[PDB]
Design a protein around this ligand. Sequence first.
Ligand SMILES: C#CCOc1ccc(C[C@H]2NC[C@H](O)[C@H]2OC(C)=O)cc1
Ligand SMILES: [K+]
Ligand SMILES: [K+]
Ligand SMILES: [K+]
Ligand SMILES: [K+]
Ligand SMILES: [K+]
Ligand SMILES: [K+]
Ligand SMILES: [K+]
Ligand SMILES: [K+]
Ligand SMILES: [Mg+2]
Ligand SMILES: [Mg+2]
Ligand SMILES: [Mg+2]
Ligand SMILES: [Mg+2]
Ligand SMILES: [Mg+2]
Ligand SMILES: [Mg+2]
Ligand SMILES: [Mg+2]
Ligand SMILES: [Mg+2]
Ligand SMILES: [Mg+2]
Ligand SMILES: [Mg+2]
Ligand SMILES: [Mg+2]
Ligand SMILES: [Mg+2]
Ligand SMILES: [Mg+2]
Ligand SMILES: [Mg+2]
Ligand SMILES: [Mg+2]
Ligand SMILES: [Mg+2]
Ligand SMILES: [Mg+2]
Ligand SMILES: [Mg+2]
Ligand SMILES: [Mg+2]
Ligand SMILES: [Mg+2]
Ligand SMILES: [Mg+2]
Ligand SMILES: [Mg+2]
Ligand SMILES: [Mg+2]
Ligand SMILES: [Mg+2]
Ligand SMILES: [Mg+2]
Ligand SMILES: [Mg+2]
Ligand SMILES: [Mg+2]
Ligand SMILES: [Mg+2]
Ligand SMILES: [Mg+2]
Ligand SMILES: [Mg+2]
Ligand SMILES: [Mg+2]
Ligand SMILES: [Mg+2]
Ligand SMILES: [Mg+2]
Ligand SMILES: [Mg+2]
Ligand SMILES: [Mg+2]
Ligand SMILES: [Mg+2]
Ligand SMILES: [Mg+2]
Ligand SMILES: [Mg+2]
Ligand SMILES: [Mg+2]
Ligand SMILES: [Mg+2]
Ligand SMILES: [Mg+2]
Ligand SMILES: [Mg+2]
Ligand SMILES: [Mg+2]
Ligand SMILES: [Mg+2]
Ligand SMILES: [Mg+2]
Ligand SMILES: [Mg+2]
Ligand SMILES: [Mg+2]
Ligand SMILES: [Mg+2]
Ligand SMILES: [Mg+2]
Ligand SMILES: [Mg+2]
Ligand SMILES: [Mg+2]
Ligand SMILES: [Mg+2]
Ligand SMILES: [Mg+2]
Ligand SMILES: [Mg+2]
Ligand SMILES: [Mg+2]
Ligand SMILES: [Mg+2]
Ligand SMILES: [Mg+2]
Ligand SMILES: [Mg+2]
Ligand SMILES: [Mg+2]
Ligand SMILES: [Mg+2]
Ligand SMILES: [Mg+2]
Ligand SMILES: [Mg+2]
Ligand SMILES: [Mg+2]
Ligand SMILES: [Mg+2]
Ligand SMILES: [Mg+2]
Ligand SMILES: [Mg+2]
Ligand SMILES: [Mg+2]
Ligand SMILES: [Mg+2]
Ligand SMILES: [Mg+2]
Ligand SMILES: [Mg+2]
Ligand SMILES: [Mg+2]
Ligand SMILES: [Mg+2]
Ligand SMILES: [Mg+2]
Ligand SMILES: [Mg+2]
Ligand SMILES: [Mg+2]
Ligand SMILES: [Mg+2]
Ligand SMILES: [Mg+2]
Ligand SMILES: [Mg+2]
Ligand SMILES: [Mg+2]
Ligand SMILES: [Mg+2]
Ligand SMILES: [Mg+2]
Ligand SMILES: [Mg+2]
Ligand SMILES: [Mg+2]
Ligand SMILES: [Mg+2]
Ligand SMILES: [Mg+2]
Ligand SMILES: [Mg+2]
Ligand SMILES: [Mg+2]
Ligand SMILES: [Mg+2]
Ligand SMILES: [Mg+2]
Ligand SMILES: [Mg+2]
Ligand SMILES: [Mg+2]
Ligand SMILES: [Mg+2]
Ligand SMILES: [Mg+2]
Ligand SMILES: [Mg+2]
Ligand code: NA
Ligand code: NA
Ligand code: NA
Ligand code: NA
Ligand code: NA
Ligand code: NA
Ligand code: NA
Ligand code: NA
Lengths: 221, 404
Amino acid sequence: AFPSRKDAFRAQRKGAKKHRPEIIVIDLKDHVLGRAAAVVAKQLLLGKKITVVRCEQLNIAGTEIRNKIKYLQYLRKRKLTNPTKGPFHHRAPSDVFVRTVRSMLPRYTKRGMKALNSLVAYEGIPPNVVRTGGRVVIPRAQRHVCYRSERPYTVLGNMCKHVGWKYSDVVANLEKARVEKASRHHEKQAKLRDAWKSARKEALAKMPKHNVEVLKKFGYA
Amino acid sequence: SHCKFEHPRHGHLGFLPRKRSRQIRGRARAFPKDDATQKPHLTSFMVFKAGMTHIVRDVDRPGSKVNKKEVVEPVTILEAPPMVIVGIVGYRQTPVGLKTIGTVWAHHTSVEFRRRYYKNWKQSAQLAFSRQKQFANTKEGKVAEARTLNAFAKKASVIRVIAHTQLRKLRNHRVGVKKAHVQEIQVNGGSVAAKIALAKSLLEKEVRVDSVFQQSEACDVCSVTKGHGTEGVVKRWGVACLPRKTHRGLRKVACIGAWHPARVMYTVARAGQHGYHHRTQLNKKIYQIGRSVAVEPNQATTTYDLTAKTITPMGGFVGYGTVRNDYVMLKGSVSGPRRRVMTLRRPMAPQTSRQLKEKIVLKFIDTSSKIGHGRFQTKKEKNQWFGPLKKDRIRREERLRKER
RNA sequence: AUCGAAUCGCCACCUACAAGACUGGAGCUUGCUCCCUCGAAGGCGCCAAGUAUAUUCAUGAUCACAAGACA
RNA sequence: GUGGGAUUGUGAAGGGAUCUCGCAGGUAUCGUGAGGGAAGUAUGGGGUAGUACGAGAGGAACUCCCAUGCCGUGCCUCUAGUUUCUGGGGUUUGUCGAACGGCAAGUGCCCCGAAGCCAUCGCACGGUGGUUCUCGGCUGAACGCCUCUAAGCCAGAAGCCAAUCCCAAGACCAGAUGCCCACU
RNA sequence: CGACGUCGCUUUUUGAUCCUUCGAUGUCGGCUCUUCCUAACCUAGCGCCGCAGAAGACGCUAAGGGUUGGAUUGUUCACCCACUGACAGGGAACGUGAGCUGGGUUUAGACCGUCGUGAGACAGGUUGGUUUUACCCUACUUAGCUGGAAAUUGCGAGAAAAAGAUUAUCCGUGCAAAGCGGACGUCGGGUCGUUGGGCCUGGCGAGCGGUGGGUAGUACAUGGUACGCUCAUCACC
RNA sequence: UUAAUGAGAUUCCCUCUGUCCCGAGUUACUAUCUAGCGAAACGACAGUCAAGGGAACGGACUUGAAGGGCUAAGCGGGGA
RNA sequence: UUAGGGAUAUGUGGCGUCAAAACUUAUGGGCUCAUUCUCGAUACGUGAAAAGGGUGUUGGUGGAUACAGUUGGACCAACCGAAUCCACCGGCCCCGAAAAUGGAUGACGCUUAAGCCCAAUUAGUGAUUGCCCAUUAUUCCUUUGGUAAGGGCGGAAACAAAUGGAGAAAGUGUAGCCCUUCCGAUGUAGAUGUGGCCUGGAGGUUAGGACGAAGCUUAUGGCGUGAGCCUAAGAUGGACCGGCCUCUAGUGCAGAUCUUGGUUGGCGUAGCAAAGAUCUAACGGAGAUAUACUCAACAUGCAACGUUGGAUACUGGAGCGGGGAAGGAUUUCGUGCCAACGGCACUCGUA
RNA sequence: UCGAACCACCUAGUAGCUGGUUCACAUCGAAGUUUCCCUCAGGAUAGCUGGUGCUAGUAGAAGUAUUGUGCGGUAAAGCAA
RNA sequence: AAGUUUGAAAAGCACUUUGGAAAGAGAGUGAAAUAGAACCUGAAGUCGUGACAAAGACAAUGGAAGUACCUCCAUUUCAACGGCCAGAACCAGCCCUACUGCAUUAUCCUGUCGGGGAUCAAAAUCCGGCGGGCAACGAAGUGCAAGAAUCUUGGGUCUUGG
Ligand SMILES: C#CCOc1ccc(C[C@H]2NC[C@H](O)[C@H]2OC(C)=O)cc1
Ligand SMILES: [K+]
Ligand SMILES: [K+]
Ligand SMILES: [K+]
Ligand SMILES: [K+]
Ligand SMILES: [K+]
Ligand SMILES: [K+]
Ligand SMILES: [K+]
Ligand SMILES: [K+]
Ligand SMILES: [Mg+2]
Ligand SMILES: [Mg+2]
Ligand SMILES: [Mg+2]
Ligand SMILES: [Mg+2]
Ligand SMILES: [Mg+2]
Ligand SMILES: [Mg+2]
Ligand SMILES: [Mg+2]
Ligand SMILES: [Mg+2]
Ligand SMILES: [Mg+2]
Ligand SMILES: [Mg+2]
Ligand SMILES: [Mg+2]
Ligand SMILES: [Mg+2]
Ligand SMILES: [Mg+2]
Ligand SMILES: [Mg+2]
Ligand SMILES: [Mg+2]
Ligand SMILES: [Mg+2]
Ligand SMILES: [Mg+2]
Ligand SMILES: [Mg+2]
Ligand SMILES: [Mg+2]
Ligand SMILES: [Mg+2]
Ligand SMILES: [Mg+2]
Ligand SMILES: [Mg+2]
Ligand SMILES: [Mg+2]
Ligand SMILES: [Mg+2]
Ligand SMILES: [Mg+2]
Ligand SMILES: [Mg+2]
Ligand SMILES: [Mg+2]
Ligand SMILES: [Mg+2]
Ligand SMILES: [Mg+2]
Ligand SMILES: [Mg+2]
Ligand SMILES: [Mg+2]
Ligand SMILES: [Mg+2]
Ligand SMILES: [Mg+2]
Ligand SMILES: [Mg+2]
Ligand SMILES: [Mg+2]
Ligand SMILES: [Mg+2]
Ligand SMILES: [Mg+2]
Ligand SMILES: [Mg+2]
Ligand SMILES: [Mg+2]
Ligand SMILES: [Mg+2]
Ligand SMILES: [Mg+2]
Ligand SMILES: [Mg+2]
Ligand SMILES: [Mg+2]
Ligand SMILES: [Mg+2]
Ligand SMILES: [Mg+2]
Ligand SMILES: [Mg+2]
Ligand SMILES: [Mg+2]
Ligand SMILES: [Mg+2]
Ligand SMILES: [Mg+2]
Ligand SMILES: [Mg+2]
Ligand SMILES: [Mg+2]
Ligand SMILES: [Mg+2]
Ligand SMILES: [Mg+2]
Ligand SMILES: [Mg+2]
Ligand SMILES: [Mg+2]
Ligand SMILES: [Mg+2]
Ligand SMILES: [Mg+2]
Ligand SMILES: [Mg+2]
Ligand SMILES: [Mg+2]
Ligand SMILES: [Mg+2]
Ligand SMILES: [Mg+2]
Ligand SMILES: [Mg+2]
Ligand SMILES: [Mg+2]
Ligand SMILES: [Mg+2]
Ligand SMILES: [Mg+2]
Ligand SMILES: [Mg+2]
Ligand SMILES: [Mg+2]
Ligand SMILES: [Mg+2]
Ligand SMILES: [Mg+2]
Ligand SMILES: [Mg+2]
Ligand SMILES: [Mg+2]
Ligand SMILES: [Mg+2]
Ligand SMILES: [Mg+2]
Ligand SMILES: [Mg+2]
Ligand SMILES: [Mg+2]
Ligand SMILES: [Mg+2]
Ligand SMILES: [Mg+2]
Ligand SMILES: [Mg+2]
Ligand SMILES: [Mg+2]
Ligand SMILES: [Mg+2]
Ligand SMILES: [Mg+2]
Ligand SMILES: [Mg+2]
Ligand SMILES: [Mg+2]
Ligand SMILES: [Mg+2]
Ligand SMILES: [Mg+2]
Ligand SMILES: [Mg+2]
Ligand SMILES: [Mg+2]
Ligand SMILES: [Mg+2]
Ligand SMILES: [Mg+2]
Ligand SMILES: [Mg+2]
Ligand SMILES: [Mg+2]
Ligand SMILES: [Mg+2]
Ligand SMILES: [Mg+2]
Ligand SMILES: [Mg+2]
Ligand code: NA
Ligand code: NA
Ligand code: NA
Ligand code: NA
Ligand code: NA
Ligand code: NA
Ligand code: NA
Ligand code: NA
């Protein structure tokens, strides 16, 4: 994680600038857990670097009690002779998603671990990801197109909090502060947004006339 | 087939692995729950175990057979020289646990605190904190300290102070260690701004045990037990001894597992390290918070026993020496041997019981010799029994005649 | 400083939020009518700093990892 | 680039080439806590009370208070056990001429015996919130009435989960710090 | 609770079979020790009763915890004495013999009864009758060293970080505001590339400081640090 | 039937005790570390588990769960 | 259902990921909600289930009533203004449904299914092959063998080098006389064939070797489907030996608790623990006081021997005392010596 | 060394039983059934298989139909035969 | 059990140096001491050393395809020359896709009359009578299709050979 002094020295000798790999950031809020994992697992195997946020807002079909009991049945499975080196049951919603993706990969091959190590999961949206670019969704894994709205569903964070996850309140407080800060920033920069809108509207009267007709033909004016 | 008769299993599976403790000092793994309505206060203190004795007091609890009657209670005496606050640390809450924000160091640190950073201090260059001292108090140094302090105000939910023991003030010949024991003490109570105010006011200052604990309160003890090295299953786990007829030995577990699973389970008693384990012990009632003998000599004097005695028994505490500092008298026993540094923590269990709420008044403190059936409480009592001895006559006769 | 590398979309307009049994706004008649920005585009970027009066490109010879890449 | 080595086996001393390796980290603290473990569990007495109930005979329980069994984690002030401190005394046979000092009897034997270790044979300590079962209910349709349910809610078990407690970063901590060095 | 019938479950009984093992998988019982199951004896709740109370019956959720000391018998079972809240039933190669023990069973010696002409026989009785080996690999218990995120390589660049001439071109304060408050100078040189240019360096000062000299009171647990004043030195520079 | 006799088999009583309740402490020689010396048994290949099927009880096979490497002292679950 | 390969199509089974295919297809219709072995997705495989039951939801059949049925109001009839209720039979779901290490639609997971029944192939548009996987099918190339099928084989004629070529065998089998064509090709026990391979000798024939035979060594390559053959190199060796035809036999090795020799992990491990015991100085000995720099000595030559003098202890006369028989036969004695041996050591010794 | 010692020999005793059995490729390729046997862990004997062929290469062909012409007493049915 | 099988000849390693010695380092003999005395040749197995290759834990080994690096190996080529690599052309043969005609509808298509239906009133769904008929837009998703990929320059063949 933390760069070595040799790595920093080599970069300065090369004189290169800041580098960021092409990373897709997925907002997992109101996404079906299984369908999102299957889509993400295939993309990881195709060499994509994927970061998922708001894992605590994933959805599973059924009542919360039914899915809580499902996790508790998974929790009771452990190597009796030595619970260490036994099955490791992770309670955080981001680790639950990571485990779901891992079971959908060839995890016991080097290629499978290369795909798995290309995925980063978070609860909420941490500051290092907030300003990296627009977030994406998976339309075929979204709740409002996947579930019939009459059926009950569970939120992953609510299920995880009652089976051992201890940071439900921390994530909620951090997410509240993030949205207020983003809303305040978005309440500002409105003048900049409207200034460019009027600049595009006023520019129609300054460009050559035949260029306006071309824009109208292709539905841009 | 099922076991013929049932009995509870030997030992507690929650104290595993039965390995040597990572550190020799007692460290609180958790602190009492913070409540913002109280004034800021420290929650722990480091002490040294001197020895044991017993006291006499009246019992106040109604409804008991010992109500308004005297009882004899063993107590443990722990030397508590004052602690020095050398730093402030702040923690912010993250989804993966607390993270340290930064450290604000005091402008001056004691020599015995800097000795902790060396394996051979006397033969070293002794350059610890030399650049920090030069950087601090400068224009950039003062700004950096202010920025770190402001970060604590904005992002910290937990404020702790860095404290260390004073082995120069302890003045113990058998303790050996000259480098201070360093620990973090959480500041509970008040707002985060109020916690930083107290921590700043305590920088470079001494803190006494009586400002952290009160006489009749209870406290938790974090300490490491006495080590015994490799021990067998009989002593390590309390299993039964096999009959005298047994071939290849008696002090063993006969069956260490069934055929299936084809493994030895983690629940089977095996020989290994015994002792030297960290233990957090609950509800140790403070029976006395004593003052230094240089300040108040009559440490063991009570309102009922008017004999002028110190807390140190006749002939000294065995293997430890004299208690020369402030001390804490805890009811009962604590884990670990003499000379070992221990942490007293403010209690985390509820303290609403009648036993925990009782006000303790000591009537008699035993100061007889811990070496071989002490029968005198003071040296004067021994002199009155024997009177002048042969060696007293020789010493007096030489002084009376040769020198006069 | 070995080191020649694979990678080929930038942004200080997306990089805030929430709901799909109804989120542009009204009316009463409650599914129709009316108003509007008319409800199906994140903005740029693709060879003249801008749609015109223009201007070096070769022989790197007909493909070859773009023989180059801080947009 | 620079530093350090080497090459394939019939000689020697010199020149090239070609390979391999080093070129930024060390050292000392304070913490985080994922995951794993996981523990406290029972009885009696006082009081309620000779009360509720009952014709009578009989005859209860919770709050609270005080003890105790088992289990667990320690501790050595007291009491007990243990002595190769062969500590100090006795005492038998042999033995150095005797006394002294002792010595041998694989610790001669006897009594007492500190320190240390140690015994429910002694002493101390053993805690908090949730999610739910079963079930009892609220609101309420389907089905004009009705209904704990079917959409919603409440209450809630020694179960279960977390706190407390134990190990803890191969959980690879871009957690925080002290000194050098390297880069600059 | 449930006759006459009828439908199941289980593998803690026996039987049926003969798939595995006969160049060998150590046989009963007990002792010890751990774990698992629930068809629940006690302990936590909750229904119902031919439920007044007390004591109980039946049933549901629940295996977290507990489930004893003895006489006879090799016994498993059985039975009796006694304590208790209760003294529930079972699995784990009929758990467990390189863990023990060896009383039984089942060699060779010997006695009795019955049978056999006999040698001998008897799921009839009786007494006496060698219990071997771990230093290997795993497992488990403790105990050391030690690299490693491309899980040893790639130079293959992702921070639960900041927030801007593209993180450069200062520090606070504030809401990623509106604003607001601060900042050591001066005189030269050298050396590279659009504005009071970057970097290196020298002389005068000043300021914040680190050490030591001389001095005064005070603090703190009282030998040992801090603090005022004043010199010297070093650093930012 | 039988006195005496018996390393013969059995039952009870007194005494006595670590046989037991219930374990604790100590000693010599080991084990343990070192110097010198220095084997054997055994050895297809090897050596983490769950379930599944399978010659009906897998270290290898299927699907999952684990597993950084090398080591010292033990230990008797497995290696049918 | 199987010679060695390629391409194109399929079979069974599939198309959410693992895992190729609907990057979760349709502009197809319905049904299902299942709280601790955890709804279902199991042909064979019963390789998990019954009788019985459900006012769960969705369908049917046959009857009954319609100013109805339920309420409110006075055991019956009136207000009140809509469709009800009676029996029976299906579908899916649920209960019945309890076992021992933690675990299994294969795992994750799935509920606008990724479940069940049915039905399609880019969809009321305009016609009858969605897609993915074989040692199968079709087809192309090569091999090999046939109950194989045919052609050619009387050199057509012409043609030096320096500057079109080569071959053409009347043939079972070879480097196959050459060319064309068709079909088959797996296989335990077992049979047979092979101008099939290899080894020691013999009769022949033809060669090689001191300018290096046999043997041996190999990241030495080439040839053969193979058994194997051949070349290269030896910074290997030092005297014999290859090819071909025929003859001949003690003629080919991975295993027989195989035989003999050697080696080997275990392993510097188990251990070398009954008979109480040695200490000290000096002498002897190569066995030491054994040293780059720095450096007064310790922290850099350790540990071990024999003799003598002291010390301490043991045997304790049924003795590690002094003599004999049996047995042994030079072990006796002196000097010298330390390779092996005296399971450690020796400067000592029954060597 | 004893419910018949030891040494050499007959003796390489016999064994329907256990174990082993050394090169390649090619063309073909089974049976665990019949009868007899002191036969039931084994043999003979037919069958299945290989090799060698012989005979005028469609001949005396067929695990299949059709059409004629025979045979039958199981499924079903019946007990009012 | 054991070939004394060193070498043609003992010419069997004088002498120097370290070491108590055994021996080592040199120097000599010899064609050859790696021919140094149980001495020709000197295999396998096992082990040491230097160099290099890397490598988690999938016991290791193995199969098939590639790749990175090495190669004391073989062969070929080195002028308008190549037996090397690659791309486009054309041919022949295959394998694919595009472009469609014949037949058939009637339980059907229309108009009109009557009924019936539901509406504020209609219409329509529906049933009869009669009269016409080709539902003909890419009519139908109904039976069969033979349409020279030359016309009218489709695609592939690193799945063939030129
Ligand atoms: C008498 C009698 C009955 O009880 C037994 C007990 C043990 C055995 C031995 C067999 N057990 C499995 C294997 O077949 C054999 O293992 C071995 C070591 O031979 C047989 C019968
Ligand atoms: K936990
Ligand atoms: K647990
Ligand atoms: K780490
Ligand atoms: K057997
Ligand atoms: K109960
Ligand atoms: K008998
Ligand atoms: K051939
Ligand atoms: K051998
Ligand atoms: Mg929706
Ligand atoms: Mg039991
Ligand atoms: Mg038992
Ligand atoms: Mg048992
Ligand atoms: Mg015994
Ligand atoms: Mg024994
Ligand atoms: Mg004492
Ligand atoms: Mg003596
Ligand atoms: Mg005593
Ligand atoms: Mg049975
Ligand atoms: Mg059997
Ligand atoms: Mg055995
Ligand atoms: Mg066997
Ligand atoms: Mg066994
Ligand atoms: Mg139950
Ligand atoms: Mg229970
Ligand atoms: Mg239990
Ligand atoms: Mg058994
Ligand atoms: Mg059983
Ligand atoms: Mg045994
Ligand atoms: Mg046994
Ligand atoms: Mg056993
Ligand atoms: Mg017996
Ligand atoms: Mg008779
Ligand atoms: Mg017997
Ligand atoms: Mg007998
Ligand atoms: Mg006997
Ligand atoms: Mg790396
Ligand atoms: Mg297993
Ligand atoms: Mg074992
Ligand atoms: Mg053992
Ligand atoms: Mg083919
Ligand atoms: Mg294909
Ligand atoms: Mg796929
Ligand atoms: Mg779909
Ligand atoms: Mg099935
Ligand atoms: Mg299956
Ligand atoms: Mg079935
Ligand atoms: Mg049914
Ligand atoms: Mg129903
Ligand atoms: Mg139904
Ligand atoms: Mg129904
Ligand atoms: Mg499952
Ligand atoms: Mg299922
Ligand atoms: Mg499946
Ligand atoms: Mg062919
Ligand atoms: Mg001619
Ligand atoms: Mg021929
Ligand atoms: Mg064949
Ligand atoms: Mg021969
Ligand atoms: Mg010849
Ligand atoms: Mg080689
Ligand atoms: Mg090799
Ligand atoms: Mg030959
Ligand atoms: Mg032979
Ligand atoms: Mg061989
Ligand atoms: Mg063998
Ligand atoms: Mg070895
Ligand atoms: Mg040893
Ligand atoms: Mg021994
Ligand atoms: Mg001895
Ligand atoms: Mg001597
Ligand atoms: Mg020395
Ligand atoms: Mg010496
Ligand atoms: Mg003696
Ligand atoms: Mg004696
Ligand atoms: Mg005598
Ligand atoms: Mg004698
Ligand atoms: Mg002699
Ligand atoms: Mg020796
Ligand atoms: Mg004998
Ligand atoms: Mg036979
Ligand atoms: Mg055989
Ligand atoms: Mg065949
Ligand atoms: Mg038979
Ligand atoms: Mg046979
Ligand atoms: Mg047989
Ligand atoms: Mg019949
Ligand atoms: Mg009939
Ligand atoms: Mg009849
Ligand atoms: Mg010469
Ligand atoms: Mg040689
Ligand atoms: Mg030679
Ligand atoms: Mg030789
Ligand atoms: Mg060799
Ligand atoms: Mg080697
Ligand atoms: Mg493998
Ligand atoms: Mg390769
Ligand atoms: Mg009409
Ligand atoms: Mg007509
Ligand atoms: Mg169509
Ligand atoms: Mg055409
Ligand atoms: Mg073509
Ligand atoms: Mg071609
Ligand atoms: Na005592
Ligand atoms: Na006798
Ligand atoms: Na095995
Ligand atoms: Na596996
Ligand atoms: Na559907
Ligand atoms: Na042929
Ligand atoms: Na020893
Ligand atoms: Na009409």
